[PDB]
């Protein structure tokens, strides 16, 4: 079964309108198209999420508020601050249709996996992992990752969420904090002052979900080899302990060298090794994007990872296409790490891995 690629011209145009990542969806799609990768995938038009689908996670009061301020773009509603709207998540006109489109696209990908249409379904414009049931957060108005997991739960009894974004996947972790049917694994920068502030290795979930949240706090400057070593170690133990039946994988590209966040120092090759490790489990896998604020590098990264999913080696030269002039100064697909130090002490990393190994001993059946 060829991978499913969630795409429509109207969906990309809607995603392009997000003020924090303008035209990023067009750049990702047009680069993948220029490498001719869409011909090797099953292109599926996303459905827009219904109110009832979004309310599987979000409260009706939040959804109705988002719908109301979306009408005229009311960025001064008295209740908006209560719902997390205003600064990182402004109440712009049409944002509810934007949110419902991204939520629906991830649900559509999940439904493709349930129906056996494919073993891999891709929504690069998804991955908005910070939104809470009743609150926008960190550029995220709707938590499409949670919506996709809840759709997968119609069929799959154990779902593994893996979050390789620079930031802690707090909204997804919190949504499933109290359950053992969904295990969340997040690798992220963890440093006092760095958003969202949560996700220490000691954060393991709560109640019946205790030990079914895994957090790998990492410092500035990590590069491909050490990151893969960490990721493989954790995922090997998680797979043995939890035996997931489906995977949701968030691949935010704000870890990549050259991102204005200027924190990690990864290239798509290292992220791609993590992706390959998950793919060889041969489980139903839902692929999401996320952060990524060097727009050309984010397109480079997700195009390369689409190649990985397809088992294809891509030419190093960026093909001639609409956004070719954005790929300077070198106009190649490869990304060179910055000449910055790796702040990850090997013994602290090993201590973190030791803690996680101990936690996963408690994970039973
Ligand atoms: O990538 C993300 C979204 C990050 C949400 C924003 C965090 C706060 C922040 O970095 N704000 C900021 C960034 C650049 C310039 C000014 C403020 N989540 O994974
Ligand atoms: K993460
Ligand atoms: K959990
Ligand atoms: Zn991020």
Short mmCIF file of N, CA, C and O in Angstrom, two decimals, residues 18-138:
data_model
loop_
_atom_site.label_atom_id
_atom_site.label_comp_id
_atom_site.label_asym_id
_atom_site.label_seq_id
_atom_site.Cartn_x
_atom_site.Cartn_y
_atom_site.Cartn_z
N UNK A 18 -1.74 30.90 8.16
CA UNK A 18 -1.33 31.00 9.56
C UNK A 18 -0.19 32.00 9.69
O UNK A 18 0.90 31.78 9.14
N UNK A 19 -0.44 33.08 10.43
CA UNK A 19 0.49 34.21 10.45
C UNK A 19 1.87 33.83 10.97
O UNK A 19 2.85 34.51 10.65
N UNK A 20 1.98 32.76 11.75
CA UNK A 20 3.26 32.36 12.30
C UNK A 20 4.13 31.61 11.30
O UNK A 20 5.35 31.57 11.48
N UNK A 21 3.54 31.01 10.27
CA UNK A 21 4.31 30.25 9.29
C UNK A 21 3.77 30.53 7.89
O UNK A 21 3.36 29.60 7.19
N UNK A 22 3.76 31.79 7.44
CA UNK A 22 3.07 32.12 6.19
C UNK A 22 3.71 31.44 4.99
O UNK A 22 4.93 31.47 4.81
N UNK A 23 2.86 30.83 4.16
CA UNK A 23 3.22 30.15 2.92
C UNK A 23 4.05 28.89 3.16
O UNK A 23 4.52 28.28 2.20
N UNK A 24 4.23 28.48 4.41
CA UNK A 24 5.04 27.29 4.66
C UNK A 24 4.42 26.05 4.03
O UNK A 24 5.14 25.21 3.48
N UNK A 25 3.09 25.91 4.11
CA UNK A 25 2.47 24.72 3.54
C UNK A 25 2.69 24.65 2.04
O UNK A 25 2.98 23.58 1.49
N UNK A 26 2.59 25.81 1.36
CA UNK A 26 2.89 25.85 -0.08
C UNK A 26 4.33 25.48 -0.36
O UNK A 26 4.62 24.80 -1.36
N UNK A 27 5.27 25.92 0.47
CA UNK A 27 6.67 25.59 0.21
C UNK A 27 6.92 24.10 0.37
O UNK A 27 7.63 23.49 -0.43
N UNK A 28 6.34 23.50 1.41
CA UNK A 28 6.51 22.07 1.63
C UNK A 28 5.93 21.28 0.47
O UNK A 28 6.59 20.42 -0.12
N UNK A 29 4.68 21.59 0.10
CA UNK A 29 4.02 20.85 -0.96
C UNK A 29 4.72 21.04 -2.29
O UNK A 29 4.93 20.07 -3.04
N UNK A 30 5.11 22.27 -2.61
CA UNK A 30 5.69 22.53 -3.92
C UNK A 30 7.08 21.92 -4.06
O UNK A 30 7.49 21.56 -5.17
N UNK A 31 7.82 21.77 -2.95
CA UNK A 31 9.11 21.09 -3.05
C UNK A 31 8.93 19.59 -3.23
O UNK A 31 9.61 18.97 -4.06
N UNK A 32 8.02 19.00 -2.45
CA UNK A 32 7.70 17.59 -2.62
C UNK A 32 7.21 17.31 -4.04
O UNK A 32 7.61 16.32 -4.66
N UNK A 33 6.37 18.20 -4.57
CA UNK A 33 5.90 18.07 -5.95
C UNK A 33 7.04 18.15 -6.95
O UNK A 33 7.08 17.39 -7.92
N UNK A 34 7.99 19.07 -6.72
CA UNK A 34 9.08 19.24 -7.68
C UNK A 34 10.02 18.04 -7.69
O UNK A 34 10.68 17.79 -8.71
N UNK A 35 10.09 17.31 -6.59
CA UNK A 35 10.83 16.05 -6.57
C UNK A 35 9.99 14.88 -7.07
O UNK A 35 10.45 13.74 -7.00
N UNK A 36 8.77 15.14 -7.55
CA UNK A 36 7.86 14.16 -8.13
C UNK A 36 7.41 13.09 -7.14
O UNK A 36 7.02 11.99 -7.54
N UNK A 37 7.42 13.39 -5.84
CA UNK A 37 7.06 12.38 -4.84
C UNK A 37 5.56 12.13 -4.74
O UNK A 37 5.16 11.05 -4.30
N UNK A 38 4.74 13.10 -5.15
CA UNK A 38 3.29 12.93 -5.04
C UNK A 38 2.78 11.83 -5.98
O UNK A 38 1.74 11.23 -5.71
N UNK A 39 3.50 11.56 -7.07
CA UNK A 39 3.11 10.49 -7.98
C UNK A 39 3.28 9.11 -7.34
O UNK A 39 2.69 8.14 -7.83
N UNK A 40 4.05 9.01 -6.27
CA UNK A 40 4.28 7.74 -5.59
C UNK A 40 3.42 7.59 -4.35
O UNK A 40 3.61 6.64 -3.58
N UNK A 41 2.47 8.49 -4.14
CA UNK A 41 1.61 8.46 -2.97
C UNK A 41 0.15 8.53 -3.41
O UNK A 41 -0.16 8.91 -4.55
N UNK A 42 -0.74 8.14 -2.50
CA UNK A 42 -2.18 8.25 -2.71
C UNK A 42 -2.64 9.58 -2.14
O UNK A 42 -2.66 9.77 -0.92
N UNK A 43 -2.98 10.51 -3.02
CA UNK A 43 -3.40 11.84 -2.60
C UNK A 43 -4.85 11.76 -2.13
O UNK A 43 -5.73 11.34 -2.89
N UNK A 44 -5.10 12.15 -0.88
CA UNK A 44 -6.43 12.09 -0.29
C UNK A 44 -6.84 13.49 0.16
O UNK A 44 -6.13 14.14 0.93
N UNK A 45 -8.01 13.93 -0.30
CA UNK A 45 -8.55 15.22 0.10
C UNK A 45 -8.98 15.20 1.57
O UNK A 45 -9.74 14.30 1.97
N UNK A 46 -8.55 16.15 2.39
CA UNK A 46 -8.97 16.15 3.79
C UNK A 46 -10.44 16.55 3.92
O UNK A 46 -10.94 17.39 3.17
N UNK A 47 -11.11 15.93 4.87
CA UNK A 47 -12.42 16.39 5.30
C UNK A 47 -12.24 17.40 6.42
O UNK A 47 -11.28 17.34 7.19
N UNK A 48 -13.15 18.36 6.50
CA UNK A 48 -13.14 19.32 7.60
C UNK A 48 -13.77 18.67 8.81
O UNK A 48 -14.80 17.98 8.70
N UNK A 49 -13.16 18.86 9.98
CA UNK A 49 -13.69 18.27 11.21
C UNK A 49 -15.05 18.85 11.56
O UNK A 49 -15.23 20.07 11.57
N UNK A 50 -16.00 17.97 11.86
CA UNK A 50 -17.28 18.41 12.39
C UNK A 50 -17.12 18.91 13.82
O UNK A 50 -16.12 18.64 14.50
N UNK A 51 -18.14 19.63 14.30
CA UNK A 51 -18.15 20.07 15.69
C UNK A 51 -18.04 18.88 16.64
O UNK A 51 -17.29 18.94 17.63
N UNK A 52 -18.76 17.79 16.36
CA UNK A 52 -18.73 16.63 17.24
C UNK A 52 -17.36 15.96 17.25
O UNK A 52 -16.93 15.43 18.28
N UNK A 53 -16.68 15.96 16.10
CA UNK A 53 -15.33 15.39 16.06
C UNK A 53 -14.35 16.24 16.87
O UNK A 53 -13.54 15.70 17.63
N UNK A 54 -14.42 17.56 16.74
CA UNK A 54 -13.53 18.40 17.53
C UNK A 54 -13.84 18.31 19.01
O UNK A 54 -12.93 18.40 19.84
N UNK A 55 -15.11 18.10 19.36
CA UNK A 55 -15.50 18.00 20.75
C UNK A 55 -15.14 16.65 21.38
O UNK A 55 -15.38 16.48 22.57
N UNK A 56 -14.58 15.71 20.61
CA UNK A 56 -14.01 14.52 21.24
C UNK A 56 -12.92 14.90 22.23
O UNK A 56 -12.68 14.18 23.21
N UNK A 57 -12.25 16.03 22.00
CA UNK A 57 -11.27 16.53 22.94
C UNK A 57 -11.63 17.90 23.48
O UNK A 57 -11.56 18.12 24.70
N UNK A 58 -11.99 18.86 22.62
CA UNK A 58 -12.15 20.23 23.06
C UNK A 58 -13.54 20.45 23.63
O UNK A 58 -14.51 19.79 23.24
N UNK A 59 -13.64 21.38 24.58
CA UNK A 59 -14.96 21.64 25.17
C UNK A 59 -15.84 22.41 24.19
O UNK A 59 -15.35 23.17 23.35
N UNK A 60 -17.15 22.21 24.31
CA UNK A 60 -18.08 22.94 23.45
C UNK A 60 -17.96 24.44 23.68
O UNK A 60 -18.07 25.23 22.74
N UNK A 61 -17.73 24.85 24.94
CA UNK A 61 -17.59 26.27 25.23
C UNK A 61 -16.39 26.87 24.51
O UNK A 61 -16.47 27.97 23.96
N UNK A 62 -15.26 26.15 24.51
CA UNK A 62 -14.09 26.64 23.79
C UNK A 62 -14.36 26.70 22.29
O UNK A 62 -14.05 27.70 21.63
N UNK A 63 -14.90 25.62 21.73
CA UNK A 63 -15.14 25.59 20.29
C UNK A 63 -16.12 26.68 19.87
O UNK A 63 -15.92 27.32 18.83
N UNK A 64 -17.17 26.90 20.66
CA UNK A 64 -18.13 27.95 20.32
C UNK A 64 -17.51 29.33 20.45
O UNK A 64 -17.81 30.23 19.66
N UNK A 65 -16.63 29.52 21.44
CA UNK A 65 -15.94 30.80 21.54
C UNK A 65 -15.04 31.03 20.34
O UNK A 65 -15.04 32.12 19.74
N UNK A 66 -14.24 30.03 19.98
CA UNK A 66 -13.37 30.16 18.81
C UNK A 66 -14.19 30.46 17.56
O UNK A 66 -13.80 31.31 16.74
N UNK A 67 -15.33 29.79 17.41
CA UNK A 67 -16.22 30.04 16.27
C UNK A 67 -16.73 31.48 16.26
O UNK A 67 -16.78 32.12 15.20
N UNK A 68 -17.08 32.00 17.44
CA UNK A 68 -17.64 33.35 17.53
C UNK A 68 -16.60 34.41 17.19
O UNK A 68 -16.86 35.31 16.38
N UNK A 69 -15.41 34.34 17.79
CA UNK A 69 -14.42 35.38 17.52
C UNK A 69 -13.85 35.25 16.12
O UNK A 69 -13.32 36.23 15.58
N UNK A 70 -13.98 34.08 15.50
CA UNK A 70 -13.54 33.89 14.13
C UNK A 70 -14.42 34.63 13.13
O UNK A 70 -13.96 34.92 12.02
N UNK A 71 -15.66 34.97 13.50
CA UNK A 71 -16.61 35.55 12.55
C UNK A 71 -16.10 36.87 11.98
O UNK A 71 -15.97 37.03 10.76
N UNK A 72 -15.81 37.84 12.85
CA UNK A 72 -15.28 39.13 12.40
C UNK A 72 -13.80 39.30 12.69
O UNK A 72 -13.22 40.31 12.27
N UNK A 73 -13.17 38.35 13.38
CA UNK A 73 -11.80 38.55 13.82
C UNK A 73 -11.70 39.39 15.07
O UNK A 73 -10.85 40.29 15.16
N UNK A 74 -12.57 39.13 16.05
CA UNK A 74 -12.66 39.90 17.28
C UNK A 74 -11.50 39.50 18.19
O UNK A 74 -11.57 38.47 18.87
N UNK A 75 -10.44 40.30 18.20
CA UNK A 75 -9.27 40.03 19.04
C UNK A 75 -9.34 40.78 20.37
O UNK A 75 -8.30 40.97 21.02
N UNK A 76 -10.53 41.22 20.79
CA UNK A 76 -10.72 41.91 22.06
C UNK A 76 -11.94 41.39 22.81
O UNK A 76 -12.51 42.12 23.63
N UNK A 77 -12.35 40.15 22.56
CA UNK A 77 -13.48 39.60 23.28
C UNK A 77 -13.13 39.42 24.75
O UNK A 77 -12.03 38.95 25.06
N UNK A 78 -14.03 39.78 25.67
CA UNK A 78 -13.69 39.66 27.10
C UNK A 78 -13.33 38.25 27.54
O UNK A 78 -12.52 38.09 28.46
N UNK A 79 -13.88 37.23 26.91
CA UNK A 79 -13.59 35.87 27.33
C UNK A 79 -12.35 35.27 26.68
O UNK A 79 -11.94 34.17 27.06
N UNK A 80 -11.74 35.97 25.71
CA UNK A 80 -10.70 35.32 24.91
C UNK A 80 -9.47 34.97 25.74
O UNK A 80 -8.84 33.93 25.50
N UNK A 81 -9.11 35.81 26.71
CA UNK A 81 -7.93 35.52 27.52
C UNK A 81 -8.12 34.22 28.29
O UNK A 81 -7.18 33.43 28.45
N UNK A 82 -9.35 33.97 28.76
CA UNK A 82 -9.65 32.73 29.47
C UNK A 82 -9.39 31.50 28.60
O UNK A 82 -9.03 30.44 29.11
N UNK A 83 -9.56 31.64 27.29
CA UNK A 83 -9.42 30.54 26.35
C UNK A 83 -8.05 30.52 25.66
O UNK A 83 -7.88 29.83 24.65
N UNK A 84 -7.08 31.27 26.18
CA UNK A 84 -5.73 31.27 25.64
C UNK A 84 -5.53 32.07 24.37
O UNK A 84 -4.50 31.89 23.70
N UNK A 85 -6.47 32.93 24.01
CA UNK A 85 -6.38 33.70 22.78
C UNK A 85 -5.85 35.10 23.07
O UNK A 85 -6.18 35.69 24.10
N UNK A 86 -5.04 35.63 22.16
CA UNK A 86 -4.60 37.01 22.31
C UNK A 86 -3.16 37.29 21.93
O UNK A 86 -2.90 38.21 21.15
N UNK A 87 -2.21 36.54 22.48
CA UNK A 87 -0.80 36.79 22.19
C UNK A 87 -0.27 35.77 21.19
O UNK A 87 -0.26 36.03 19.99
N UNK A 88 0.20 34.61 21.67
CA UNK A 88 0.71 33.60 20.75
C UNK A 88 -0.39 33.10 19.81
O UNK A 88 -0.09 32.62 18.72
N UNK A 89 -1.65 33.20 20.23
CA UNK A 89 -2.79 32.70 19.44
C UNK A 89 -3.81 33.81 19.25
O UNK A 89 -4.86 33.80 19.90
N UNK A 90 -3.57 34.75 18.35
CA UNK A 90 -4.54 35.83 18.13
C UNK A 90 -5.83 35.32 17.53
O UNK A 90 -5.86 34.32 16.80
N UNK A 91 -6.92 36.03 17.83
CA UNK A 91 -8.25 35.70 17.31
C UNK A 91 -8.44 36.39 15.96
O UNK A 91 -9.04 37.47 15.86
N UNK A 92 -7.94 35.75 14.91
CA UNK A 92 -8.05 36.33 13.58
C UNK A 92 -9.27 35.79 12.85
O UNK A 92 -9.79 34.71 13.17
N UNK A 93 -9.75 36.55 11.88
CA UNK A 93 -10.91 36.12 11.11
C UNK A 93 -10.63 34.81 10.40
O UNK A 93 -9.58 34.64 9.76
N UNK A 94 -11.55 33.86 10.54
CA UNK A 94 -11.44 32.57 9.88
C UNK A 94 -10.64 31.52 10.61
O UNK A 94 -10.50 30.41 10.10
N UNK A 95 -10.12 31.83 11.81
CA UNK A 95 -9.24 30.89 12.50
C UNK A 95 -9.97 29.60 12.86
O UNK A 95 -9.35 28.52 12.92
N UNK A 96 -11.28 29.66 13.07
CA UNK A 96 -12.03 28.45 13.38
C UNK A 96 -12.07 27.51 12.18
O UNK A 96 -11.93 26.29 12.33
N UNK A 97 -12.27 28.06 10.98
CA UNK A 97 -12.23 27.22 9.78
C UNK A 97 -10.82 26.67 9.56
O UNK A 97 -10.66 25.53 9.12
N UNK A 98 -9.80 27.49 9.83
CA UNK A 98 -8.42 27.03 9.80
C UNK A 98 -8.21 25.85 10.73
O UNK A 98 -7.71 24.80 10.32
N UNK A 99 -8.63 26.00 11.99
CA UNK A 99 -8.45 24.94 12.98
C UNK A 99 -9.21 23.68 12.59
O UNK A 99 -8.67 22.57 12.68
N UNK A 100 -10.45 23.84 12.13
CA UNK A 100 -11.24 22.67 11.76
C UNK A 100 -10.66 21.94 10.55
O UNK A 100 -10.79 20.72 10.44
N UNK A 101 -10.03 22.69 9.63
CA UNK A 101 -9.39 22.06 8.49
C UNK A 101 -8.20 21.22 8.91
O UNK A 101 -8.03 20.09 8.44
N UNK A 102 -7.36 21.75 9.80
CA UNK A 102 -6.18 20.98 10.21
C UNK A 102 -6.61 19.79 11.05
O UNK A 102 -6.11 18.67 10.85
N UNK A 103 -7.56 19.99 11.96
CA UNK A 103 -8.08 18.87 12.73
C UNK A 103 -8.68 17.81 11.83
O UNK A 103 -8.43 16.62 12.00
N UNK A 104 -9.49 18.23 10.85
CA UNK A 104 -10.08 17.27 9.95
C UNK A 104 -9.06 16.53 9.11
O UNK A 104 -9.23 15.35 8.80
N UNK A 105 -7.97 17.21 8.72
CA UNK A 105 -6.95 16.54 7.93
C UNK A 105 -6.27 15.43 8.72
O UNK A 105 -5.99 14.36 8.17
N UNK A 106 -5.99 15.66 10.00
CA UNK A 106 -5.38 14.61 10.80
C UNK A 106 -6.36 13.47 11.05
O UNK A 106 -5.98 12.30 11.00
N UNK A 107 -7.64 13.80 11.27
CA UNK A 107 -8.65 12.77 11.42
C UNK A 107 -8.79 11.96 10.14
O UNK A 107 -8.91 10.73 10.17
N UNK A 108 -8.77 12.64 8.99
CA UNK A 108 -8.84 11.92 7.72
C UNK A 108 -7.67 10.95 7.58
O UNK A 108 -7.84 9.80 7.16
N UNK A 109 -6.46 11.40 7.92
CA UNK A 109 -5.31 10.50 7.88
C UNK A 109 -5.51 9.30 8.81
O UNK A 109 -5.22 8.16 8.44
N UNK A 110 -5.99 9.55 10.03
CA UNK A 110 -6.26 8.46 10.96
C UNK A 110 -7.30 7.49 10.40
O UNK A 110 -7.16 6.27 10.54
N UNK A 111 -8.34 8.02 9.75
CA UNK A 111 -9.39 7.16 9.19
C UNK A 111 -8.84 6.29 8.07
O UNK A 111 -9.21 5.12 7.95
N UNK A 112 -7.94 6.84 7.24
CA UNK A 112 -7.28 6.04 6.22
C UNK A 112 -6.55 4.86 6.84
O UNK A 112 -6.55 3.76 6.29
N UNK A 113 -5.90 5.08 7.99
CA UNK A 113 -5.15 4.00 8.62
C UNK A 113 -6.09 2.95 9.19
O UNK A 113 -5.82 1.75 9.08
N UNK A 114 -7.19 3.38 9.82
CA UNK A 114 -8.20 2.47 10.35
C UNK A 114 -8.75 1.57 9.25
O UNK A 114 -8.91 0.35 9.43
N UNK A 115 -9.05 2.15 8.09
CA UNK A 115 -9.67 1.45 6.97
C UNK A 115 -8.68 0.58 6.20
O UNK A 115 -9.09 -0.07 5.23
N UNK A 116 -7.41 0.57 6.58
CA UNK A 116 -6.43 -0.23 5.87
C UNK A 116 -6.06 0.28 4.50
O UNK A 116 -5.47 -0.46 3.71
N UNK A 117 -6.38 1.54 4.19
CA UNK A 117 -6.00 2.12 2.91
C UNK A 117 -4.49 2.17 2.73
O UNK A 117 -3.99 2.13 1.60
N UNK A 118 -3.76 2.25 3.84
CA UNK A 118 -2.33 2.50 3.84
C UNK A 118 -1.78 2.08 5.20
O UNK A 118 -2.54 1.85 6.15
N UNK A 119 -0.46 1.99 5.28
CA UNK A 119 0.21 1.84 6.56
C UNK A 119 0.86 3.14 7.04
O UNK A 119 1.20 3.24 8.23
N UNK A 120 1.02 4.12 6.16
CA UNK A 120 1.54 5.44 6.51
C UNK A 120 0.62 6.49 5.91
O UNK A 120 0.31 6.43 4.71
N UNK A 121 0.18 7.45 6.73
CA UNK A 121 -0.64 8.57 6.28
C UNK A 121 0.00 9.86 6.79
O UNK A 121 0.35 9.95 7.97
N UNK A 122 0.14 10.85 5.90
CA UNK A 122 0.94 12.04 6.15
C UNK A 122 0.05 13.28 6.14
O UNK A 122 -0.68 13.52 5.18
N UNK A 123 0.13 14.08 7.21
CA UNK A 123 -0.45 15.43 7.24
C UNK A 123 0.64 16.38 7.74
O UNK A 123 0.73 16.66 8.93
N UNK A 124 1.45 16.90 6.81
CA UNK A 124 2.56 17.76 7.22
C UNK A 124 2.10 19.06 7.87
O UNK A 124 2.86 19.66 8.63
N UNK A 125 0.88 19.52 7.59
CA UNK A 125 0.39 20.75 8.19
C UNK A 125 -0.24 20.54 9.56
O UNK A 125 -0.71 21.52 10.16
N UNK A 126 -0.24 19.31 10.08
CA UNK A 126 -0.71 19.04 11.41
C UNK A 126 0.42 19.05 12.43
O UNK A 126 1.53 19.50 12.16
N UNK A 127 0.10 18.55 13.62
CA UNK A 127 1.08 18.47 14.70
C UNK A 127 0.99 19.54 15.76
O UNK A 127 1.99 19.78 16.45
N UNK A 128 -0.17 20.18 15.96
CA UNK A 128 -0.24 21.35 16.84
C UNK A 128 -0.48 20.88 18.28
O UNK A 128 -1.59 20.93 18.84
N UNK A 129 0.62 20.47 18.91
CA UNK A 129 0.63 19.62 20.09
C UNK A 129 0.42 20.35 21.42
O UNK A 129 0.33 19.67 22.45
N UNK A 130 0.31 21.68 21.44
CA UNK A 130 0.17 22.40 22.70
C UNK A 130 -1.27 22.68 23.12
O UNK A 130 -1.49 22.97 24.30
N UNK A 131 -2.23 22.66 22.20
CA UNK A 131 -3.58 23.10 22.56
C UNK A 131 -4.19 22.18 23.61
O UNK A 131 -4.02 20.96 23.57
N UNK A 132 -4.93 22.78 24.55
CA UNK A 132 -5.60 22.06 25.62
C UNK A 132 -7.08 21.92 25.30
O UNK A 132 -7.59 22.50 24.34
N UNK A 133 -7.79 21.16 26.14
CA UNK A 133 -9.20 20.95 25.87
C UNK A 133 -9.97 22.26 25.78
O UNK A 133 -10.89 22.39 24.96
N UNK A 134 -9.58 23.27 26.57
CA UNK A 134 -10.34 24.52 26.66
C UNK A 134 -9.46 25.74 26.47
O UNK A 134 -9.82 26.84 26.92
N UNK A 135 -8.31 25.60 25.81
CA UNK A 135 -7.36 26.70 25.75
C UNK A 135 -6.43 26.54 24.56
O UNK A 135 -5.83 25.47 24.36
N UNK A 136 -6.33 27.59 23.75
CA UNK A 136 -5.26 27.69 22.78
C UNK A 136 -3.93 27.89 23.50
O UNK A 136 -3.88 28.44 24.60
N UNK A 137 -2.85 27.46 22.86
CA UNK A 137 -1.53 27.55 23.48
C UNK A 137 -0.44 27.39 22.42
O UNK A 137 -0.56 26.54 21.54
N UNK A 138 0.60 28.21 22.51
CA UNK A 138 1.80 28.03 21.69
C UNK A 138 1.56 27.87 20.19
O UNK A 138 2.07 26.93 19.57
#
